[PDB]
Amino acid sequence: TRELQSLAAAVVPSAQTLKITDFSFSDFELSDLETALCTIRMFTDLNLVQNFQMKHEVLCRWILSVKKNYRKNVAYHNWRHAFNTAQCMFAALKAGKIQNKLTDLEILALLIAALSHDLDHRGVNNSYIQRSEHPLAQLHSIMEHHHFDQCLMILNSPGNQILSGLSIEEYKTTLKIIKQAILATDLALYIKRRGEFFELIRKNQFNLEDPHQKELFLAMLMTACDLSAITKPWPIQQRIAELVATEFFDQGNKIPSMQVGFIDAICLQLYEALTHVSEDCFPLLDGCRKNRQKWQALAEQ
Numbered sequence: 001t002r003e004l005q006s007l008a009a010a011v012v013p014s015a016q017t018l019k020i021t022d023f024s025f026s027d028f029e030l031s032d033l034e035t036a037l038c039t040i041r042m043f044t045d046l047n048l049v050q051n052f053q054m055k056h057e058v059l060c061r062w063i064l065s066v067k068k069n070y071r072k073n074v075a076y077h078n079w080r081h082a083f084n085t086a087q088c089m090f091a092a093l094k095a096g097k098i099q100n101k102l103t104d105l106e107i108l109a110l111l112i113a114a115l116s117h118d119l120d121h122r123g124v125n126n127s128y129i130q131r132s133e134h135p136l137a138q139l140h141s142i143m144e145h146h147h148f149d150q151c152l153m154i155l156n157s158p159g160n161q162i163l164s165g166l167s168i169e170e171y172k173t174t175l176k177i178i179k180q181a182i183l184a185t186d187l188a189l190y191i192k193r194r195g196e197f198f199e200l201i202r203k204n205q206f207n208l209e210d211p212h213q214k215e216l217f218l219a220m221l222m223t224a225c226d227l228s229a230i231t232k233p234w235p236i237q238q239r240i241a242e243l244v245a246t247e248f249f250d251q252g253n254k255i256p257s258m259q260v261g262f263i264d265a266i267c268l269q270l271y272e273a274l275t276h277v278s279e280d281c282f283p284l285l286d287g288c289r290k291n292r293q294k295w296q297a298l299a300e301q
């Protein structure tokens, strides 16, 4: 409650001041409270506070509840990863001008989903807890369903209901988009569905007015921001790879070639496709290409 008193009383600096419009954004120098103020600015500058009549105190309480339900003893899959994913979504909507291709309910759900998509992640080497639970459902996007459960629980918690200003129809619609968006962060679903996305772009058939292609695009965008650490400037990306390695190996050199393979198999084609959708998202592809060059030079020793 003392952290809530400081956050609700602080003046939120502008998006430019907070540098959240830049694809190169990094959070290493920010306090936890500073990350919360940037998150308020994301809601504010996307007009989510205005169009959906969000009480200031409820938004702050919701942001702090989301933050507290990430585990800091997890080296990468923590609150800062979710905060950065949301920042990339904000930068993609603003700096990439994607914002005008989507409705307010879709933008509202994407921001919420980005912030919530990894809630209560226990670390890649602690998947035994989600097996003590659901001992039969182990051989399903097991974790992404749990992440949405966590998100929904927080959205419904007293004093935390940032969607109370929505009508019941807008709420059901928003909840559905949130659910699909969080579930899309399952890389298996990404690999399963990315092929249809690429051929649509390749054949120049990509149609945002198609309800199926709009949903497909929302999934790809969630993956793009989820993995956006791979696009950051070289000093940032080196630090993130350190965090990924700690969670993976130390439950908290082979890394260069692992990063190059990850860029090739997963990342490069997605950011290539996204630039065909909007050339203003090119910095993500450019940053990813530069990082591959750096890791590959190290990989060759």
Ligand SMILES: O=C(O)/C=C/c1ccc2c(=O)[nH]c(Cc3cccc(Cl)c3)nc2c1
Pocket (backbone or CB within 6 Å): 077, 081, 118, 226, 227, 229, 230, 240, 241, 244, 245, 248, 255, 258, 259, 262
């Ligand atoms: O689920 C998420 O939130 C995002 C996931 C993710 C993010 C970054 C990365 C990333 O840099 N590299 C790699 C490849 C990798 C795998 C294992 C150890 C290392 Cl040292 C590197 N895999 C990654 C996976």
Ligand SMILES: [Mg+2]
Pocket (backbone or CB within 6 Å): 117, 118, 185, 186
């Ligand atoms: Mg995840």
Ligand SMILES: [Zn+2]
Pocket (backbone or CB within 6 Å): 081, 117, 118, 185, 226
């Ligand atoms: Zn994630």
